[PDB]
Write a protein that binds this ligand. Sequence first.
Ligand code: NI
Ligand code: NI
Ligand code: NI
Ligand code: NI
Ligand SMILES: [O-]
Ligand SMILES: [O-]
Lengths: 570, 570, 122, 100, 100, 100
Amino acid sequence: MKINRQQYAESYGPTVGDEVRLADTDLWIEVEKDYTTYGDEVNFGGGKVLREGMGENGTYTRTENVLDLLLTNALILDYTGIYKADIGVKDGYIVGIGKGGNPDIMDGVTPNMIVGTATEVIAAEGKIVTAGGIDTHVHFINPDQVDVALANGITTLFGGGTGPAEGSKATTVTPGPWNIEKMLKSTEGLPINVGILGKGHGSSIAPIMEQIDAGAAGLKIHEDWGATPASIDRSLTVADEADVQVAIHSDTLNEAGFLEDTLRAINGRVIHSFHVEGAGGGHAPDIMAMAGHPNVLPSSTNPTRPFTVNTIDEHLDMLMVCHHLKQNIPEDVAFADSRIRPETIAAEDILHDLGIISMMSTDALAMGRAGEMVLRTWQTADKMKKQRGPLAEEKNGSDNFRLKRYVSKYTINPAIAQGIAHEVGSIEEGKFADLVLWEPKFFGVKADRVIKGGIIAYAQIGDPSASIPTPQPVMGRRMYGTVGDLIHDTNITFMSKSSIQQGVPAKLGLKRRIGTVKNCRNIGKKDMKWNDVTTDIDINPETYEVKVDGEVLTCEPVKELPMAQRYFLF
Amino acid sequence: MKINRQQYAESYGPTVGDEVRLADTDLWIEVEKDYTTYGDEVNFGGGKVLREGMGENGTYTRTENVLDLLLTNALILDYTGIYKADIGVKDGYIVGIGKGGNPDIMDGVTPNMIVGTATEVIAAEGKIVTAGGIDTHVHFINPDQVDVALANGITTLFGGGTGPAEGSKATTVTPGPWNIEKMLKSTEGLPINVGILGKGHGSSIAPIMEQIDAGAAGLKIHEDWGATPASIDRSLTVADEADVQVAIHSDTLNEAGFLEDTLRAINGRVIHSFHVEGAGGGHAPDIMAMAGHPNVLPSSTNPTRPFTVNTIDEHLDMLMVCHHLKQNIPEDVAFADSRIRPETIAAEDILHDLGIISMMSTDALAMGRAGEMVLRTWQTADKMKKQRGPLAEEKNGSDNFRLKRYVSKYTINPAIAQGIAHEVGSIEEGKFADLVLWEPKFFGVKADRVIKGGIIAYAQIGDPSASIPTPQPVMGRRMYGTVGDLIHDTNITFMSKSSIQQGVPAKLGLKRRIGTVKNCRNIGKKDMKWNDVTTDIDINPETYEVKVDGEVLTCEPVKELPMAQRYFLF
Amino acid sequence: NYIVPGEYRVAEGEIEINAGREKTTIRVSNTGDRPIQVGSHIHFVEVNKELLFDRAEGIGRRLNIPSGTAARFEPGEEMEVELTELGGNREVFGISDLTNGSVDNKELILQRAKELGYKGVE
Amino acid sequence: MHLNPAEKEKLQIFLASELLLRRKARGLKLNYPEAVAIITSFIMEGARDGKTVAMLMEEGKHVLTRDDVMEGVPEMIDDIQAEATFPDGTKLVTVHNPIS
Amino acid sequence: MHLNPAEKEKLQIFLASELLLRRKARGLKLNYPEAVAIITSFIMEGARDGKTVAMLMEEGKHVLTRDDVMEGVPEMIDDIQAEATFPDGTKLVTVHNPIS
Amino acid sequence: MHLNPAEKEKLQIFLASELLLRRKARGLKLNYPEAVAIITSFIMEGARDGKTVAMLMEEGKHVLTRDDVMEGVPEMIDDIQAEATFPDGTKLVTVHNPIS
Ligand code: NI
Ligand code: NI
Ligand code: NI
Ligand code: NI
Ligand SMILES: [O-]
Ligand SMILES: [O-]
């Protein structure tokens, strides 16, 4: 008996060689391999395979190679591959990627992926499954930002802030031991993973270090607190001792130095350069040259992503509004013109496509959109395909190389930068079960279901009074993973090694899972998956033209994007 | 001095012999007796009776026969009677039904119903008060379902699920020790009583039993997991050891057996047959014959309740949608036609009226409506009165017999089936104070106030910014019983004896009241209050005609129901 | 170049299920008066007693149909079906409790089937 | 009013439909959520009018045509489901392939 | 806008009134929540117009008559209460027996 | 529909604008939240229409004039900001001193 491929794909999701369109983009991903045994696919329902004595084993207790949860027939999109597999989860972690079911009667069952009495099932046939997004540039300004992030598939928020205080509205900073303690306690009620950044400012070590000991997971150097050579130096000395990451928003004003002075202060130490293109902040006009260096982990923030016809007008005015700048003060106009540059924004598109900028992030509520990191990553990839063509690395027909390069920017790379990739950032055995299911038609736009620690936390679902869950209105809603004490077991608070050793979680009564930040100081650009390119980036101080390998990097802004007015009510 | 009965009823609620219409139905309930002493009625307000030295005693401390709460002048509708009384609550439990006030000066005061310094008052004059509804067929799919249930007077949810995972969207099952632990922790944030069902599937005892030890309160056998003779047998062996109830959704497909095979596997042991009519699932076409047997506790789910002109068209399509069935595949059409049957749906109305189906339930979000169990019970009773007449048992004029038969279906009977009637399910001294106040005009449609453990949890109330609580918009809202740690003291998590003995609540940090499931295995149809009839139900395999005592049970579908478009905005 | 969001572009060819496993065709009759529908992965010898077929030919086998589909027998209907071999360890537990171990134990399975009235033990 | 949770939620469908109808009236091709809102509100208002489930399954396929919506929207909408209070209580309507 | 909790809530009354007015316009006898919504929104808009509490107590009894609503609805509505911002601040209006 | 949190919230702006437009139509001078609602909804509908950010910065200054609003309202509104989905994705529009 044979099944035609159209009918197979409709029933079980796609298999090897089949392609799927990402939303309404021109991007096609192709199934590279498939772990199934044809005829023994797992599925659940009336008269289906996962029934006792059949695809469900009726013999084994939970400890005996049985799963807590099986996602059947997933199309995985990850830095590790684009492929078809069942995903097995146990104790909140991914324990198996392969083929689930019952070894009694099925061929090819992965030995620790037994469906048993203890096993829940999520049908992933016809869905794309990715890791949860890791947003490393979050300003904690308004708690309503969490659902916004979850709805676009983000599952970890790294950053700082105490709410809508000016320090926090400007900088990803929770300053000092007391504010840090308060925000660790607030975090107990946020249905998302969290890590908190302290203020990377001071000329003595102790005031900076005591934040790490209090429970910060990293530091932010920000020009609004003085991004001076001294603050840069002390923060990196702390970070090297503490094994945490430092993010920087550099001295746009060039007040205490130019880019080369900031690099001298860094002195070859590892650093995460936020909004590296510079519209979001940094040494005018040449900050983006940071992304060429081996010790720099470079990210973009999302409003420049990608370069469109409204980008400049929007940014010039956004900047003037936010800094209370006046159009009739020439220094204000000069500042704005030095900071918002089509030459560097256009080059930023291309640097992403080339693997020179390694990460995406939001800048949520400060100069960026909490629910558009994933969205804008794919809009960028689509624009680059249209303007630059398939990458040379592609094996005819598919966009798999580009898809792996771009998915890495908001999943594994930010996790590696922050020292948390042992726990999150990819679909790999041994990592926390933060997983996002997407219908291909909504891919990158609106998540179907967001799984946190192996329990659904957020879902697009309908009328709670209806006979079935699909009648209108279908909207994003918090699910049982967020309710009661389950919010503690399905989310991680990431903290410094020292705060954990000093018993801060017990002192504060933290009940969430505690994650350790580690292996942040011994990495570089080379460790950024699919985005590991170092090169000399030249930014002309007169024209702002960007050159790499002797060639000007330029492209046009687009008038329309996919993943836009077809989907959104406003 | 004498008061005319119209004026008496307006001031104090109705008294003996007075009748009240249930919503906009044709059903009339009559006050059977009244515990008051005329002239010494309790009431509260400016210049009213419950004042210090008067109807409120000023001498006694709380421990000394004083109540925490008195509901004054309640018209109780319960399996135990339809009668007028004050209701006294203390330590979260009903401690007195009788006459409240001050023995200093009033005649006829029940000795432990003293209104004292410690006593809060709820005015129930002109209200009907019932026990909270006990829904034993809940799929835990979307947390927004809890308020939907509370708004129609449901106070206990028994069932299973982990959110909108396919296993849970199909089956009332929280599978295995880990999912059960996670959902017990989630339950800490749900403002309603809860019991969790494990997966009633396996061929070895240990995988099933470990769910009971983990904290499950019962088991669900579901065809979607294999409702095989072996799974039926092992689940009942577990249940008999553990003293928990087993629910079944049987093998519709007749794959491993017909109804008689399922009954043989049951082997006379006690079982709760869900959606016994079978549109909601079970041996096609004859599952409803289960309701004749002495060891079967039979429930309906709500979308077939009652038989209306849109029922069939709605169900046929609902079934096709949910099973992804195609109208041009003859086996799919044959399946649907074998499962959705006007002959058995019409007979189901009558079997309710005769006391042969003992219980109602929702099937919330799987094939049933979370907020319509109570609603549809009364619509069924009203239809049956219109089509069959007053029951022979009625004492002229009133519908009290029918009202007690039907109120029992969603209050006491499900509580007895589940082993929880020592705690909930009726307005009786010694039981938990889960009470629902209804305005007669909204009876069965929208609850006025829902009391949980003696504190109001949910209420229809107006503008929170207004001078008084009655200005618009009046809508269902969570009250103080649901806030902070009070949610722990006003709700019960029901659990197996073994999990309680093994210290699961302490292990998981559960703060809710813990209820013990017990006395589930030594009951039968005979123990279903007002609904205790056993008989041979014949279902013709060719015509689907249902016969009891040699007579075909049939009735017509209705074009209109009460408790419908007069009340609902959508 | 009309865009259907999320559309597939499947490869050429067909998918062969249960490749390399022995196939067997047998006649099966629903002798009962109610419909019986049989899923792809039920041990075929353990189906409803009132299905009449050579029960020995169902041992260690299941329907050779796509995973998650079923064969339907209306009341009184007789038809041919194609079976394939079970895989993995070739053991069955539970279901109708006819096997509870290796499917190689044909005499024991048939003894149990016969005693319990599973039609077609020869 | 005594609004329950569903009544509160479903007001939003009516509102989204009103928004979408204004967009259509000024000449815009409608998008996915706009199209779904219009058809959903149509079903709920039809129930209020006292139509049958069968009538609405038919009518729901003629509310919007492909020229009313953006490219790909017809193929994005496999079905639209709504529950509303009919004269005979709450019922589910599913409109299959509403826009051809 | 600086919306406070009451301003957010009361938008829903206006919306429900708009829904109910459309139902009335196409010939339907109105139900309980529809009737309450129309009269409530009338009161709040009247306050906005600068009418007095006394004027609205009078006018509120003439917004809907028994022929506008289903059987039993007049007797279900004993009064309708609304607070709104008058020229002289927030005041409570109660319309007694609004539909005779 | 697949509504996200922002789509749900922004429905309320459209509704408040509809309310305010009805108030203006019956002759009332508009207040602060009414004025802000009308201009905000105008911006979001303009994005939906496919106008540019630059067009809306211009047009937003001509939606309401001082004779449309109460005393002091022009001076209370320093700017109005709205984000909406343009053909090229979400963008921020700020209308400076919208009412002269
Ligand atoms: Ni910055
Ligand atoms: Ni920032
Ligand atoms: Ni069921
Ligand atoms: Ni169910
Ligand atoms: O930033
Ligand atoms: O069910």
